Coordinates of C-alpha atoms in Angstrom, one line a residue:
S1 CA 170.6 65.1 -27.1
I2 CA 166.9 65.5 -25.7
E3 CA 167.6 69.4 -24.7
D4 CA 169.5 69.2 -28.5
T5 CA 166.5 68.3 -30.6
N6 CA 163.6 70.9 -28.5
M7 CA 165.4 73.5 -29.3
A8 CA 165.7 72.9 -32.6
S9 CA 162.3 72.2 -32.0
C10 CA 161.8 75.9 -30.8
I11 CA 164.4 77.6 -33.6
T12 CA 162.1 75.9 -36.3
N13 CA 158.7 76.8 -34.5
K14 CA 160.4 80.8 -34.4
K15 CA 160.1 80.7 -38.3
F16 CA 156.9 79.1 -39.0
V17 CA 155.6 82.5 -36.6
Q18 CA 157.7 84.9 -38.1
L19 CA 156.4 83.2 -41.3
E20 CA 152.7 84.0 -40.1
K21 CA 153.2 87.7 -39.1
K22 CA 155.3 88.2 -42.9
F23 CA 152.2 87.0 -44.4
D24 CA 149.6 87.6 -42.7
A25 CA 147.9 84.6 -42.3
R26 CA 147.6 81.3 -40.2
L27 CA 149.7 78.3 -41.3
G28 CA 149.7 74.7 -40.9
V29 CA 152.6 72.3 -41.3
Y30 CA 153.4 68.5 -41.2
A31 CA 156.2 67.4 -42.6
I32 CA 157.9 62.9 -41.6
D33 CA 161.2 61.8 -43.4
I34 CA 159.6 58.0 -44.1
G35 CA 163.6 56.4 -43.5
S36 CA 164.4 58.3 -39.9
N37 CA 160.1 58.9 -38.6
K38 CA 161.3 62.5 -37.7
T39 CA 159.2 65.0 -38.0
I40 CA 158.1 68.6 -38.1
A41 CA 154.9 69.7 -37.0
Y42 CA 153.5 73.3 -36.8
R43 CA 149.4 73.7 -35.5
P44 CA 149.7 70.1 -37.5
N45 CA 146.3 69.0 -35.3
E46 CA 144.5 72.7 -36.2
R47 CA 141.9 72.6 -39.0
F48 CA 142.4 74.0 -42.7
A49 CA 139.9 74.4 -45.2
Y50 CA 141.6 71.8 -47.6
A51 CA 140.3 72.7 -51.0
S52 CA 141.9 71.2 -54.1
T53 CA 144.3 68.9 -51.9
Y54 CA 141.6 67.1 -51.4
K55 CA 141.4 65.7 -55.5
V56 CA 144.8 63.3 -55.3
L57 CA 143.0 61.4 -52.2
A58 CA 139.8 60.8 -54.0
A59 CA 140.8 59.9 -57.1
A60 CA 143.5 57.0 -54.4
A61 CA 140.4 55.9 -52.9
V62 CA 138.8 55.1 -56.4
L63 CA 141.6 53.6 -57.0
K64 CA 141.6 51.1 -54.3
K65 CA 137.9 50.7 -54.5
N66 CA 137.1 49.6 -58.7
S67 CA 139.2 47.1 -61.0
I68 CA 141.4 48.0 -63.3
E69 CA 139.0 47.0 -65.9
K70 CA 136.4 49.2 -63.9
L71 CA 138.1 51.9 -63.8
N72 CA 138.7 52.1 -67.7
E73 CA 134.9 52.2 -68.5
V74 CA 133.5 56.0 -70.0
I75 CA 131.7 57.6 -67.7
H76 CA 129.3 60.4 -70.4
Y77 CA 128.8 63.3 -68.0
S78 CA 126.4 66.3 -69.2
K79 CA 127.0 69.9 -69.9
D80 CA 124.4 70.0 -66.8
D81 CA 127.9 68.6 -65.0
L82 CA 130.4 71.5 -65.8
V83 CA 131.5 73.3 -62.8
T84 CA 133.5 76.6 -62.9
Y85 CA 136.7 75.7 -63.8
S86 CA 137.0 72.6 -65.7
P87 CA 139.4 72.8 -68.5
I88 CA 140.0 69.5 -69.3
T89 CA 136.1 67.7 -68.8
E90 CA 134.5 70.4 -70.6
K91 CA 136.7 68.9 -74.2
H92 CA 135.7 65.9 -73.9
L93 CA 131.9 66.3 -73.1
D94 CA 131.4 65.1 -76.5
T95 CA 133.8 61.8 -75.6
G96 CA 133.1 61.0 -72.4
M97 CA 136.3 60.4 -70.1
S98 CA 136.8 56.9 -68.2
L99 CA 137.3 57.0 -64.2
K100 CA 141.5 56.7 -64.7
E101 CA 141.9 59.8 -67.2
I102 CA 138.8 61.8 -64.3
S103 CA 141.7 61.2 -61.7
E104 CA 144.9 62.2 -63.9
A105 CA 142.7 65.4 -64.9
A106 CA 141.6 66.1 -61.4
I107 CA 145.3 66.0 -59.9
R108 CA 147.1 67.1 -62.5
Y109 CA 145.1 70.2 -63.5
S110 CA 142.6 70.4 -60.3
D111 CA 139.5 70.1 -62.6
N112 CA 136.5 70.6 -60.6
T113 CA 134.1 68.7 -62.6
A114 CA 136.6 66.0 -62.3
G115 CA 137.2 66.6 -58.6
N116 CA 132.6 66.1 -58.2
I117 CA 132.3 63.0 -60.2
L118 CA 134.9 61.7 -57.9
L119 CA 133.2 62.7 -55.1
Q120 CA 130.4 61.0 -56.7
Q121 CA 132.0 57.8 -57.4
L122 CA 132.9 57.1 -53.8
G123 CA 129.0 57.8 -52.6
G124 CA 129.5 61.9 -52.2
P125 CA 131.5 63.8 -49.5
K126 CA 129.6 61.5 -47.0
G127 CA 131.5 58.3 -48.9
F128 CA 134.7 59.8 -49.5
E129 CA 135.0 60.5 -45.8
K130 CA 134.3 57.0 -45.4
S131 CA 137.1 55.8 -47.4
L132 CA 139.1 57.8 -45.7
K133 CA 138.2 56.4 -42.6
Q134 CA 138.9 53.2 -43.8
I135 CA 142.6 54.1 -44.1
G136 CA 142.2 55.7 -40.1
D137 CA 141.4 58.9 -40.8
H138 CA 138.7 59.9 -38.6
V139 CA 139.6 63.5 -38.6
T140 CA 139.1 65.2 -42.1
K141 CA 134.9 66.1 -42.9
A142 CA 133.8 66.2 -46.2
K143 CA 130.1 67.4 -46.8
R144 CA 130.2 69.8 -50.2
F145 CA 130.9 69.6 -53.8
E146 CA 132.5 71.9 -56.2
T147 CA 132.5 74.6 -55.5
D148 CA 131.3 75.0 -52.5
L149 CA 133.6 73.3 -50.7
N150 CA 136.1 76.1 -51.3
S151 CA 134.2 78.6 -48.9
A152 CA 136.8 78.5 -45.8
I153 CA 134.4 80.3 -43.4
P154 CA 136.5 81.1 -40.3
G155 CA 135.2 77.9 -37.2
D156 CA 133.4 76.2 -40.5
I157 CA 134.0 72.1 -39.8
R158 CA 132.9 71.6 -43.3
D159 CA 135.3 70.3 -46.4
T160 CA 138.2 70.5 -43.4
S161 CA 141.2 68.4 -42.6
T162 CA 144.9 68.8 -40.3
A163 CA 148.2 69.1 -42.3
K164 CA 149.0 65.9 -39.6
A165 CA 145.9 64.1 -41.2
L166 CA 146.5 65.3 -44.7
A167 CA 150.0 64.1 -44.9
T168 CA 149.3 61.0 -42.8
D169 CA 146.7 60.0 -45.7
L170 CA 148.8 61.2 -48.6
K171 CA 151.5 58.6 -47.1
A172 CA 148.8 56.3 -46.6
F173 CA 148.2 56.0 -50.1
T174 CA 151.6 56.7 -51.8
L175 CA 154.2 55.0 -49.3
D176 CA 152.3 52.3 -47.3
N177 CA 151.4 49.4 -48.4
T178 CA 147.4 50.7 -49.2
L179 CA 147.0 50.4 -52.9
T180 CA 148.5 47.7 -55.3
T181 CA 152.0 48.8 -56.6
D182 CA 150.6 49.7 -60.2
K183 CA 148.1 51.7 -58.5
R184 CA 150.6 53.2 -56.6
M185 CA 152.7 53.9 -58.9
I186 CA 149.9 55.5 -61.3
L187 CA 148.8 57.2 -58.2
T188 CA 152.2 59.1 -58.2
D189 CA 153.3 59.6 -61.6
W190 CA 150.2 61.5 -61.2
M191 CA 151.3 63.7 -59.3
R192 CA 155.0 64.1 -60.8
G193 CA 155.4 67.9 -63.3
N194 CA 152.1 69.9 -63.0
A195 CA 152.6 73.4 -63.1
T196 CA 150.0 74.1 -60.7
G197 CA 152.9 73.0 -58.0
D198 CA 155.6 75.4 -59.6
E199 CA 155.1 77.9 -57.2
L200 CA 154.2 76.1 -53.9
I201 CA 156.6 73.4 -52.2
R202 CA 158.5 72.7 -55.6
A203 CA 159.7 76.4 -55.4
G204 CA 160.8 75.9 -51.5
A205 CA 163.0 72.6 -52.3
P206 CA 166.8 72.4 -52.6
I207 CA 168.3 72.0 -55.7
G208 CA 168.5 68.3 -57.3
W209 CA 164.9 67.5 -55.1
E210 CA 161.9 66.5 -56.9
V211 CA 158.2 67.5 -55.9
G212 CA 155.1 65.6 -56.4
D213 CA 152.3 67.5 -55.2
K214 CA 148.6 68.4 -55.2
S215 CA 148.2 72.1 -54.8
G216 CA 144.5 73.8 -53.3
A217 CA 143.0 77.4 -53.1
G218 CA 139.9 78.6 -51.5
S219 CA 138.6 81.5 -50.0
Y220 CA 139.4 84.3 -46.6
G221 CA 143.1 83.5 -49.1
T222 CA 143.2 80.1 -48.5
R223 CA 146.6 78.1 -50.0
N224 CA 147.7 74.5 -49.3
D225 CA 149.8 72.2 -51.1
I226 CA 150.6 68.5 -49.7
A227 CA 153.6 66.9 -51.6
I228 CA 156.1 63.8 -51.5
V229 CA 159.5 65.0 -51.5
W230 CA 162.2 62.7 -53.2
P231 CA 165.8 63.8 -52.2
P232 CA 169.0 62.0 -54.1
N233 CA 169.5 59.3 -52.2
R234 CA 167.9 59.7 -49.2
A235 CA 164.1 58.1 -48.3
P236 CA 160.7 60.3 -49.2
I237 CA 159.7 63.1 -47.6
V238 CA 155.6 63.0 -47.4
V239 CA 154.8 67.1 -46.1
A240 CA 151.3 68.9 -46.0
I241 CA 151.3 72.8 -46.0
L242 CA 148.0 74.5 -45.5
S243 CA 147.4 78.2 -45.0
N244 CA 144.8 80.9 -45.0
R245 CA 144.1 84.7 -44.2
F246 CA 141.6 86.3 -42.2
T247 CA 138.9 88.1 -44.9
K248 CA 137.7 86.5 -47.4
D249 CA 138.6 88.0 -50.8
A250 CA 142.5 88.2 -49.2
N251 CA 144.6 87.3 -51.8
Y252 CA 146.5 84.8 -50.8
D253 CA 150.7 84.7 -51.8
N254 CA 152.5 81.1 -53.0
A255 CA 156.0 82.6 -51.5
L256 CA 154.0 81.7 -48.0
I257 CA 153.7 78.2 -48.8
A258 CA 156.9 78.0 -50.6
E259 CA 159.6 79.7 -48.2
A260 CA 157.9 77.4 -45.3
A261 CA 158.5 74.2 -47.2
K262 CA 162.4 75.6 -46.9
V263 CA 162.1 75.4 -43.5
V264 CA 160.9 71.6 -43.7
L265 CA 162.8 70.7 -46.0
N266 CA 166.3 72.5 -44.8
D267 CA 165.5 71.3 -41.3
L268 CA 164.9 67.2 -41.9
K269 CA 168.0 67.9 -44.0

């Protein structure tokens, strides 16, 4: 069957090649079926800017590092801390917000000030990178805050990872024995049912399959989605799909991510 599997990989691979051509993009894919350890991989080790997908990993590291009581302490940030696109944190400027509330705002709405506060809580981008090293991720390189970290310049290693590294990290926090039971369930629920994921991996999932995701978007047409996918009566599937285009102001097309996800989920089916 070794001949049989590799021809299946060649066929799956050609679909990703055709998507890159159709959408004028570069695509990175890594998916693992937690029940069989089967994987799908396309440029799995090539670097992409992770953009807002880090927010779920930074929230997870904050959960791992901090007690329940600490995670409920109110953080009194100021108007000076608000960066572009802070729809939740800008509402609660008078009241302040807890690390738990900040984590939920970052994941559900991709609030950028929320993301910065999580990065700060971990010691800045370098401390966030150190938190990922502690779960065995020596690939991800974190350097800048929002919104500069979205610049996604060709060849630039700052604020980049790979589809394999991001998927493996997401698996580590949501499915492996890294967080306490309560923290793993809280983090997973934050990923469920958010409109920012509607046109991405969720749009490529078969009928009846639930998707919990964290989306990303940046310059050079960068458009990412990392997710846990729950098929009926099956073990979870962890999926990272990263992409970009080739000019600074290029427009992404969410359908590239959805069509890539259809390939992944139909071939892990």
